[PDB]
Ligand binder design. Structure first.
Ligand SMILES: [Cl-]
Ligand SMILES: [Zn+2]
Ligand SMILES: [Zn+2]
Length: 93
């Protein structure tokens, strides 16, 4: 890995969070459609957690500077998890 590559793949994760936010605007007509979206957001959280782990392994080669990128990735995972929690609650009333 490299700093430039981790910044690029973090930017790709940011685009994915923005896409989830845009696609919340497709919801309203019915609650049953939220299950697939919740499963998709949980898969996104797993994808981000795997990226935090990869960054920690790069830190493990003697590169403390990557903590800035790990903090940002974990904040995105927290935002995604907060959105999934709200959909689950709405789907079940
Ligand atoms: Cl999409
Ligand atoms: Zn690579
Ligand atoms: Zn759509």
């Amino acid at each position: 890995g490299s700093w430039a590559e981790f910044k690029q793949r973090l930017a790709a994760i940011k685009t994915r969070l923005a896409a989830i936010k845009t696609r919340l605007q497709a919801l309203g007509g019915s609650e049953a459609e939220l299950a697939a979206f919740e499963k998709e957001i949980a898969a996104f959280e797993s994808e981000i957690a795997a990226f935090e782990s990869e960054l920690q392994a790069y830190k493990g080669k003697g590169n403390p500077e990557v903590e800035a990128l790990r903090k940002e990735a974990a904040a995105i995972r927290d935002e995604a998890a907060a959105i999934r929690d709200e959909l689950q609650a709405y789907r079940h009333n």
